[PDB]
Amino acid sequence: MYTTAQLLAANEQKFKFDPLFLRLFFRESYPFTTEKVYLSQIPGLVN
Amino acid sequence: DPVEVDMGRSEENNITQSGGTEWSKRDKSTYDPTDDIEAYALNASGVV
Amino acid sequence: SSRLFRTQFRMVSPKRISNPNNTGDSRNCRAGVQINDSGAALGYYVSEDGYPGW
Amino acid sequence: SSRLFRTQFRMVSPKRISNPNNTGDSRNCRAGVQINDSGAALGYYVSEDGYPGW
Fold first, then answer.
1. R_g of chain D computed on alpha carbons
2. Rounded to whole angstroms, how far apart are CA atoms C14 and C28?
3. What is the secondary structure of B1-48 as a DSSP string?
4. Could you say which of C14, C32, C42, C43 would form a disulfide bridge with C18 (CB–CB 3.0 to 4.6 Å)?
5. How many Cβ contacts (< 8 angstroms) between chains C and D?
6. Contact residues, chain D, for C49 at CB < 8 Å
7. CA-to-CA distance for B45 and B9, rounded, in angstroms?
8. Which DSSP category does A10 fall into?
9. Is C53's Cβ below 8 Å from some Cβ in A?
C-alpha cells in the first residue's frame, strides 16, 4: 500500500535455436497450387 | 534479522561432481575434460 | 563516398507498405501509416520485399 | 593486337540466362541473376547454347 517498489531490468530468457537446415540444405523452396506434388528419380545405367 | 536473497538460480547450474565420475575417477592420461566442460556449458543461457 | 552525391532513390510498391502482421487499424495507425491526431502522416511501416514468399 | 580497339560486343538470349543446373529460386539468386540485398544486379549465370543437344 505504501511499499513504493522500484523495478529494475528483467530478464528475457532466450531460446537456443539455430536451424542450419532451413539455411544450409533447403535453399530451394516452392509453392503448391495443386493438391499434391510429384518427385522424379530416374536412374541412369547404360551398358 | 535474516534477509533472504534468491536470484532464482536453477539448481542444475550448481552441479556437484558426486557419483563415480568426480574428476579423479578418470585417468589423467586418457580422459579429456573438454566433453565435461562442454556438457556443463550446454545449459548456460548465454555465450561463455 | 565514391560519389559526390549521397542521395539515392528506391521505389516502394503499395503492397510493400501495410499494417505490420496484418493487424487491425487504430485511429493513429491505418494500413501501416502512423498519423497524429489531426491526421498528418508521421511514420510508415514498410514491409520488406517478401520475394520469394517463404 | 590487330586492332586499335580490343573491345567487342555479344548479345545474349534470355534463354541463356537462368539458374545454374536448373536450381530453384533463392532470395538473391533469381533466374541466375545474383543480386545484392538492395536488389541491384551483381552477376549472371550464363549458359551456352543447348543445341546440339548432346
1. 15
2. 19
3. ----------GGGS---TTT-SSTTS-TTT--THHHHHHHHHS-SS--
4. C32
5. 7
6. 39
7. 12
8. P
9. yes
